[PDB]
Amino acid sequence: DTITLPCRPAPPPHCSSNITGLILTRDGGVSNDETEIFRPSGGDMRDIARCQIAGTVVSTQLFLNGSLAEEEVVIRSVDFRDNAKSICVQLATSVEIACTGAGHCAISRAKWANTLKQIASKLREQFGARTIIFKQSSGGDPEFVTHSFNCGGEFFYCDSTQLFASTWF
Amino acid sequence: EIVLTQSPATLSLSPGERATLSCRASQSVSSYLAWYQQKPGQAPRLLIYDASNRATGIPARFSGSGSGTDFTLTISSLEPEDFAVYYCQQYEFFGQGTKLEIKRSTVAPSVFIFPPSDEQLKSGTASVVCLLNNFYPREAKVQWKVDNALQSGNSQESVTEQDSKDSTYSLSSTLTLSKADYEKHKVYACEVTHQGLSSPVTKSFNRG
Amino acid sequence: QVQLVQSGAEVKKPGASVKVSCKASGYTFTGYYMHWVRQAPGQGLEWMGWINPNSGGTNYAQKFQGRVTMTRDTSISTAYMELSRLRSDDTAVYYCARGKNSDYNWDFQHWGQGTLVTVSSASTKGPSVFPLAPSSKSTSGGTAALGCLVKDYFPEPVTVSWNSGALTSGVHTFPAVLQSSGLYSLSSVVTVPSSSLGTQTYICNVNHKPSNTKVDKKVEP
Ligand SMILES: *[C@@H]1O[C@H](CO)[C@@H](O)[C@H](O)[C@H]1NC(C)=O
Ligand SMILES: *[C@@H]1O[C@H](CO)[C@@H](O)[C@H](O)[C@H]1NC(C)=O
């Protein structure tokens, strides 16, 4: 099965990439027990620039064509206890994102689920929470609420909701 | 959740003494904490950040220190402006607060009772007021009895802020009944226990 | 010259929503996250959420997800906090607030004056004013206590004075209590020389601005 991201404008096929990582914000407050909720970063370019893993291309939510890790996915933060600090997630095995030009970009659902399972186990480890929930962006300007990216000097805005809508136990 | 437990609930000292408030954090993040001071009807004001640094316009008598899980705010030579509520903060979590009041020589309250007025009675309800005027310490128990029956749930009370002249408190309790029920009984008594009173004190009146 | 200015107090029925604004000045707006923090009467401080004014990104406390929406208008240096589907335990003073530093940004050096938001059900009502008559049952030595009971009004506040402010010594005005009927009630008392009850006049001046209600109540022995 295939996960899709609608995009405006329509990304050309040569704008296909490998997702090599991503950045997220942890919802704060006393947790509803015993769950931690994670969304694509509520921050901005500053957060992304400090991650040190973004690479050449300028993107939000997902890192494109960036660096990878050795054997396992590694999450990193300036301070995991601080909900105002974003969590930088570096994949070890990249996930292809095929753009078609029809208007949407696609990724393997099995491969992303396999990826999300690994991220969840690392987060579950760092925070100790039994369950991990990925949810869409809390809000923000168009460039951040969506997975947005610069290819060939053109800005593309892709709805990443199908990427971030699962619960892990 | 980072649970922060402050100590003590109330701190009773005199203008010139050394105040010591504490805050225990249910974790180990020991380099980040804030202390605030809050007065009635006012926004909180930052006093200390990063466990031990004075904020803007904060005199040198205020200080802070961090013993890992434990943190403390110290007020050398208390001024009368220093008496207020104090909260501690770490990330988005606050403490429950500690109140710092003037410690005073113990005074028993003056007790007064007030029967309902004919104006209210005509309306179809009756309120009896028990005033506890000018006492310290604040701990105080008021019990309402009607024909020797302990009342519960039909009374509310309210306490003033520590008075600026005599460092003392005052309480007002209100017992409210329907006129119907108020005319079914005769003896209305307010019973007050404290610590300036060797024995409980009761002020009463008979309807009529 | 950092200043945070919030909009005025509001009275709201359950189910309704409220929008509170915060105008920031004295610093570069986009440089700091803006936080909202509320305080119920007699209770502590509770964090609601932050907004990144540069991206419009937000982080809300879990207990407010689905009912709170924070936005900002960088054009006019103003942040907004919107709380919908109001219930009675949302009655609080709401504060916008900003960290002293940008790294660890949770030491709130700066606060607005705060916006009181009262969740209702009740309707505007002037208070009744009943005398608390001075008698033998309210007399200790040569001191007579008397007062006024200002009952059954909504909403807060009322103002009470004695003899048009002329008398302030020996006066206590008590914090109002909220009755289970939704209406408020407070009392005001004053201790006085009994040798003046047959001479001096004592009046409680009550003003309930929200209902255009003002009353002069003489209290007689
Ligand atoms: C994905 O990554 C690998 C790295 O070797 C590369 O060979 C492949 O062409 C990439 N696919 C896309 C669409 O960039
Ligand atoms: C990512 O790398 C692939 C493979 O070289 C390239 O074709 C593609 O244009 C890159 N993606 C972006 C958005 O630059």
Short mmCIF file of all heavy atoms in Angstrom, two decimals, chain C residues 48 83 138 171 173 180 190:
data_model
loop_
_atom_site.label_atom_id
_atom_site.label_comp_id
_atom_site.label_asym_id
_atom_site.label_seq_id
_atom_site.Cartn_x
_atom_site.Cartn_y
_atom_site.Cartn_z
N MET C 48 -0.76 27.16 29.67
CA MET C 48 -1.70 26.75 28.62
C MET C 48 -1.00 26.34 27.32
O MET C 48 -1.35 25.33 26.70
CB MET C 48 -2.70 27.86 28.34
CG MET C 48 -3.46 28.30 29.57
SD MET C 48 -4.75 29.48 29.17
CE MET C 48 -5.74 28.51 28.02
N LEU C 83 -10.12 30.65 23.74
CA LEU C 83 -10.61 29.51 24.48
C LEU C 83 -12.10 29.31 24.23
O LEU C 83 -12.92 30.16 24.57
CB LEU C 83 -10.32 29.68 25.97
CG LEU C 83 -10.51 28.43 26.84
CD1 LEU C 83 -9.72 27.26 26.28
CD2 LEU C 83 -10.09 28.73 28.26
N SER C 138 -23.29 42.60 69.79
CA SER C 138 -22.14 43.03 69.00
C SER C 138 -21.35 44.15 69.69
O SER C 138 -20.86 45.08 69.04
CB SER C 138 -22.54 43.42 67.57
OG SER C 138 -23.00 44.76 67.50
N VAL C 171 -12.25 49.70 59.76
CA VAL C 171 -13.14 49.13 58.75
C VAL C 171 -12.53 47.90 58.10
O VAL C 171 -11.34 47.87 57.79
CB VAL C 171 -13.50 50.19 57.67
CG1 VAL C 171 -14.34 49.57 56.56
CG2 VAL C 171 -14.23 51.35 58.30
N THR C 173 -13.52 45.26 54.84
CA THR C 173 -14.39 44.78 53.77
C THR C 173 -13.91 43.42 53.31
O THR C 173 -12.76 43.25 52.91
CB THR C 173 -14.49 45.78 52.62
OG1 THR C 173 -14.99 47.03 53.12
CG2 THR C 173 -15.43 45.26 51.53
N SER C 180 -24.06 29.08 45.78
CA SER C 180 -24.37 28.01 44.83
C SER C 180 -25.46 28.41 43.83
O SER C 180 -25.71 27.72 42.85
CB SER C 180 -24.75 26.71 45.56
OG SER C 180 -25.83 26.91 46.46
N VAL C 190 -17.45 47.60 60.59
CA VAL C 190 -16.63 48.64 61.20
C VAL C 190 -16.88 48.71 62.70
O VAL C 190 -18.02 48.64 63.15
CB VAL C 190 -16.88 50.02 60.54
CG1 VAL C 190 -18.36 50.30 60.42
CG2 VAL C 190 -16.18 51.12 61.32
#
